[PDB]
Amino acid sequence: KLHYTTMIMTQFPDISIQSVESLGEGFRNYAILVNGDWVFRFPKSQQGADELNKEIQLLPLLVGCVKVNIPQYVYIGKRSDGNPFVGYRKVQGQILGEDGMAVLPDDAKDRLALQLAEFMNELSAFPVETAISAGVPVTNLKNKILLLSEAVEDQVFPLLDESLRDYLTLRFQSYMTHPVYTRYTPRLIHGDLSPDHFLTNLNSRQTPLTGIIDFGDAAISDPDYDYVYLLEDCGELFTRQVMAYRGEVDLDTLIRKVSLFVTFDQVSYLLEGLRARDQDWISEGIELLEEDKANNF
């Protein structure tokens, strides 16, 4: 508390702090709300610092290209050399969350699907070279999944029933051996496009999506990756609606491709629990892998 407030007030003489409250946190950042108005967002690691340095350069170039609100860093602070933090006016609205889309009526879901399709479209139109110049990495997704499959063999396979191992090997091979999945034209992607990052004003019937946050995973990569959490967290029906508005073709094949990404996400989630040495997380991740197999076959 006093730790974050002292850094803020030392570095920003125009901020007089009357209230401070925790707002949210993810794997890479801790966010607090100052005076009900300002989000101060603090990286949790050097990797978080790298991602924030990317966002500092990228987001100002994106503001004028998207039709939702995104964070605009007004305050740029430093913890010490190479350790930035930022402050931005809260992106307004209600975070939708996972449990949000499940309850929404048809007209609202239709409008949200249209707005998300448009947002993805805008990212796919953004000049890749400008993004790279802003520190956005070029992530060859085929090579990333190859490295993942090696890690799984080493760290994950020992924990599994051989039948679940057989399933995972099948999923990795189904992705890796099909050019229909592995070849793509790279684009700027958000990289973590899950509904915990969707800000809404459901009072607006026709334009319920108002904001998107957390661009820390932004990459030049496969645009189909930005469907992964739509499928995992919003469901196949909604995901297919977004795909239709975007003019995707052969949705059965595309859904299969994204479902492979979902499998790999479940592996990744377990690997994070193994890295953290969290037995509850490990057990949860093993269960999610079993559910992935049961849901697909």
Ligand SMILES: NC[C@H]1O[C@H](O[C@H]2[C@H](O)[C@@H](O[C@H]3O[C@H](CO)[C@@H](O)[C@H](N)[C@H]3O)[C@H](N)C[C@@H]2N)[C@H](O)[C@@H](O)[C@@H]1O
């Ligand atoms: N909370 C419970 C859920 O947690 C995971 O899903 C969440 C991901 O963890 C998030 O992403 C983060 O973790 C990823 C690796 O897993 C990273 O690549 C990414 N950069 C991180 O921001 C993503 N934004 C939302 C998604 N619902 C499990 O998969 C899911 O089964 C489980 O129900």
Ligand SMILES: Nc1nc2c(ncn2[C@@H]2O[C@H](COP(=O)(O)OP(=O)(O)O)[C@@H](O)[C@H]2O)c(=O)[nH]1
């Ligand atoms: N309502 C609201 N919540 C925010 C805002 N910025 C961050 N948050 C919350 O803080 C959490 C952590 O921020 P995020 O950038 O996603 O951190 P990361 O996932 O660790 O990279 C988010 O998931 C939100 O819950 C904002 O502008 N408005």
Ligand SMILES: [Cl-]
């Ligand atoms: Cl992956």
Ligand SMILES: [Cl-]
């Ligand atoms: Cl398969």
Ligand SMILES: [Mg+2]
């Ligand atoms: Mg986040």
Ligand SMILES: [Mg+2]
């Ligand atoms: Mg992030």
